[PDB]
Write an enzyme that holds these catalytic residues in place. Structure first.
Site, PDB file in Angstrom:
ATOM      1  N   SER A  33       2.180  -4.076  11.248  1.00 48.98           N
ATOM      2  CA  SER A  33       3.591  -3.873  10.947  1.00 48.98           C
ATOM      3  C   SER A  33       4.174  -5.133  10.394  1.00 48.98           C
ATOM      4  CB  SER A  33       4.334  -3.477  12.208  1.00 48.98           C
ATOM      5  OG  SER A  33       5.703  -3.299  11.902  1.00 48.98           O
ATOM      6  N   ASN A  93       0.814  -1.147   0.000  1.00 48.51           N
ATOM      7  CA  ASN A  93       0.000   0.000   0.000  1.00 48.51           C
ATOM      8  C   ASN A  93       0.883   1.243   0.000  1.00 48.51           C
ATOM      9  OD1 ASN A  93      -3.079   0.868   0.589  1.00 48.51           O
ATOM     10  ND2 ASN A  93      -1.547   2.262   1.545  1.00 48.51           N
ATOM     11  N   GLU A 119      -6.326  -4.412   9.784  1.00 53.76           N
ATOM     12  CA  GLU A 119      -5.379  -3.414  10.187  1.00 53.76           C
ATOM     13  C   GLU A 119      -5.510  -3.231  11.721  1.00 53.76           C
ATOM     14  OE1 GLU A 119      -7.079  -0.124   7.622  1.00 53.76           O
ATOM     15  OE2 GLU A 119      -5.059  -0.164   6.729  1.00 53.76           O
ATOM     16  N   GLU A 179      -7.544   5.033   8.139  1.00 53.71           N
ATOM     17  CA  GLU A 179      -7.444   6.504   8.125  1.00 53.71           C
ATOM     18  C   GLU A 179      -8.714   7.116   7.544  1.00 53.71           C
ATOM     19  OE1 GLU A 179      -5.048  10.375   7.955  1.00 53.71           O
ATOM     20  OE2 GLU A 179      -4.521   8.455   8.909  1.00 53.71           O
ATOM     21  N   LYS A 231       0.700   4.550  -0.046  1.00 54.93           N
ATOM     22  CA  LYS A 231      -0.151   5.742   0.089  1.00 54.93           C
ATOM     23  C   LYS A 231       0.669   7.025   0.072  1.00 54.93           C
ATOM     24  CE  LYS A 231      -4.210   6.491   1.945  1.00 54.93           C
ATOM     25  NZ  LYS A 231      -4.956   6.766   0.673  1.00 54.93           N
ATOM     26  N   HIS A 291      -9.690   1.675   4.331  1.00 52.42           N
ATOM     27  CA  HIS A 291      -8.473   2.036   5.092  1.00 52.42           C
ATOM     28  C   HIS A 291      -8.835   2.718   6.389  1.00 52.42           C
ATOM     29  CE1 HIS A 291      -6.264   2.096   0.996  1.00 52.42           C
ATOM     30  NE2 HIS A 291      -7.519   2.307   0.629  1.00 52.42           N
ATOM     31  N   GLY A 298      -0.802   3.429  16.401  1.00 51.38           N
ATOM     32  CA  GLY A 298      -0.660   4.407  17.482  1.00 51.38           C
ATOM     33  C   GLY A 298       0.673   4.302  18.197  1.00 51.38           C
TER      34      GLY A 298
END
Lengths: 237, 237
Positions: B200, B10, B154, B84, B12, B82, B160
């Site tokens: 991750s 991804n 995700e 976000e 982005k 996603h 965070g």
């Protein structure tokens, strides 16, 4: 004289070394620096960024409530109107304009992006496209709101391929933007308005871009993830 | 046995060396590779990417017409949902679900992201959050549509700060997702469904993550901008 310049880094993209450089860099002239991380990266940027010349900016303005809480978190800048959003995420001129008006209403400084695609440029529609984008915004703003508005020109036509914008092609757009502003809002608002260049900015070309009369700084993409961003800020002297 | 794995990047987020590596890399097992650049970067990726194991994916699904034209341009994968977007750009569960249904209707393969925040995890709401996200999607899909759907988890709670997800915390979520699917849609659809890990992922941990039973690959963030992405694909063997 020009108004206060801005050097904005649009981090729409392991950021630690970058912040390290910004933190160590000392600038001795008046320049507002702005870093605009993604929302998921705002906490990590806020945790580490210490250079007092820098404000952290959000990349979207959701709701009046969402703005209020951003603002409480210490974030009072936002970047809106990004071409990617406009073209591929249904962010019409009015949608961007409403966001800017909300953000303005929340007491934010706002960097609104305008810009035309290569098809629109090739059709002679550069002026019509960016001024219509800008007019949509202006229609929602108070006189006083303009003190906290910043325009960024993104030459979307150059992002694509095989065109590199010259400083003079940048200046032509910026001059046109600022002339429209002077017409609609007066010489006062026009002279104080920052219009940032949002095309390809590097250490190599930043100084020459900053020489153009209606270029008040930069909204930097790629070059702002690397230590070279410091030179781009210095190019606003 | 597991279904065909996917290794998705991804992007982005100057991409040339990366594509260079992907192009030179030869994989000898069945893995669908996917790169998802921003829209403004799709032409440059399409111009350079030659590895036949790779599909290029868009990051949004605007309209039926916009999908049709994407599809004509040679792009038939899209990544949606996603975190976000969900949290900061008003992409409710239903909005994501409608996009997936449109994309599915256009003949796309779709990677839909689900995931819970650290507050929702800490409140014991992991299951409720991701299954509600998934249910919204499922409510719009045909039986056959599921052959072209891929789920990515995700762990937003880990992005965070101060939490690193273990392989087993990944597997627990993936197992729960796949159990819900088995319940609602049958053992058939469940067994064939790719559920990708979207936390991750690095060369260091990819192999251990791929060992988990309900992990069918990856939706990689950072590690996919660097030559290490090749090792992540190899970790799907």
């Amino acid at each position: 004289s020009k108004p206060q310049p801005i050097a904005a880094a649009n981090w729409k993209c392991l950021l630690v070394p970058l912040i390290e450089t910004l933190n160590a860099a000392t600038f001795d002239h008046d320049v507002q620096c702005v870093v605009a991380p993604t929302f998921l990266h705002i906490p990590m940027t806020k945790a580490r960024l210490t250079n007092p010349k820098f404000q952290i900016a959000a990349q979207n303005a959701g709701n009046a409530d969402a703005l209020a809480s951003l603002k409480d978190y210490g974030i009072s800048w936002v970047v809106l109107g990004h071409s990617e959003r406009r073209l591929y995420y249904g962010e019409t001129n009015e949608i961007v304009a409403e966001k800017v008006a909300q953000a303005c209403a929340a007491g934010f400084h706002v960097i609104v992006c305008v810009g035309e695609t290569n098809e629109e440029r090739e059709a002679g529609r550069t002026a019509a496209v960016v001024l219509t984008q800008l007019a949509a915004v202006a229609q929602k703003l108070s006189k006083e709101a303009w003190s906290r508005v910043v325009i960024a020109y993104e030459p979307v036509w150059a992002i694509g391929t095989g065109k590199v914008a010259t400083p003079q092609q940048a200046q032509e757009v910026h001059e046109l933007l600022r002339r429209w502003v002077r017409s609609k809002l007066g010489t006062d608002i026009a002279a104080q308005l920052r219009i940032l260049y949002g095309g390809s900015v590097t250490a190599k070309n930043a100084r020459t871009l900053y020489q153009m009369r209606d270029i008040n700084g930069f909204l930097v993409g790629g070059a702002s993830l690397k230590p070279e961003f410091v030179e781009i800020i210095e190019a606003t002297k």
